[PDB]
Amino acid sequence: PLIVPYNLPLPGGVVPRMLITILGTVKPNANRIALDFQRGNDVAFHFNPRFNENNRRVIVCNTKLDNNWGREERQSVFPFESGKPFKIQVLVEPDHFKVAVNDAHLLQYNHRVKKLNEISKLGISGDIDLTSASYTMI
Numbered sequence: 001p002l003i004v005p006y007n008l009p010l011p012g013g014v015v016p017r018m019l020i021t022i023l024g025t026v027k028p029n030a031n032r033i034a035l036d037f038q039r040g041n042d043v044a045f046h047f048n049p050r051f052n053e054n055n056r057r058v059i060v061c062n063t064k065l066d067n068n069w070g071r072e073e074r075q076s077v078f079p080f081e082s083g084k085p086f087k088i089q090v091l092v093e094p095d096h097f098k099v100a101v102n103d104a105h106l107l108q109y110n111h112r113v114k115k116l117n118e119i120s121k122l123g124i125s126g127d128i129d130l131t132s133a134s135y136t137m138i
């Protein structure tokens with residue numbers, strides 16, 4: 001039981017081999033969820049499950065620079081279910097973020113923002129009950 005939207009500080013930003021783990025439960029009749037890895041006002045990595053975009057479930061990922069969204073990267077593999085407990089793991093790798101949901105690889109997102117050590121906050125928003133948000137090095 002964390003309040004959403006939630007901000008998780010990432011002290012000194014991110015680095016390869018840093019693992020961020022988000023645990024929560026999707027609300028019944030969910031519409032949207034977002035994780036925003038921020039570099040100040042920029043969004044280095046936005047990870048955004050949409051439960052009803054034109055009656056399809058899709059994951060949208062993108063980057064926001066100087067208040068402008070870039071080119072979306074879309075994934076129709078959709079591992080979330082309304083009402084169910086989930087685990088999102090975001091592993092920072094040298095060239096990409098790697099995302100696994102419920103221990104199954106979902107997607108990678110190549111780094112657009114290159115100053116990894118300035119990506120110093122993770123925002124968590126949308127239609128979830130949030131249980132925990134933490135990080136470790138592996």
Ligand SMILES: CO[C@@H]1[C@@H](n2cc(-c3cc(F)c(F)c(F)c3)nn2)[C@@H](O)[C@@H](CO)O[C@H]1S[C@@H]1COC[C@H](n2cc(-c3cncnc3)nn2)[C@H]1O
Binds near residue numbers: 053061062126
């Ligand atoms: C509603 O605005 C979103 C942005 N967004 C989401 C949130 C958000 C905030 C929260 F508090 C949340 F809890 C939360 F989950 C999400 N805040 N900003 C962000 O997700 C951004 C990422 O690019 O998208 C915009 S909507 C963007 C607008 O312009 C057209 C884009 N469009 C449509 C299609 C297309 C392609 N193929 C098939 N069908 C439709 N393709 N592109 C569309 O996706």
Ligand SMILES: [Cl-]
Binds near residue numbers: 032048050
């Ligand atoms: Cl959205």
Ligand SMILES: [Cl-]
Binds near residue numbers: 030051081082
């Ligand atoms: Cl659903």
Ligand SMILES: [Cl-]
Binds near residue numbers: 112113114115
């Ligand atoms: Cl940068």
Ligand SMILES: [Cl-]
Binds near residue numbers: 038039118120
């Ligand atoms: Cl930041």
Ligand SMILES: [Mg+2]
Binds near residue numbers: 095
């Ligand atoms: Mg590569």
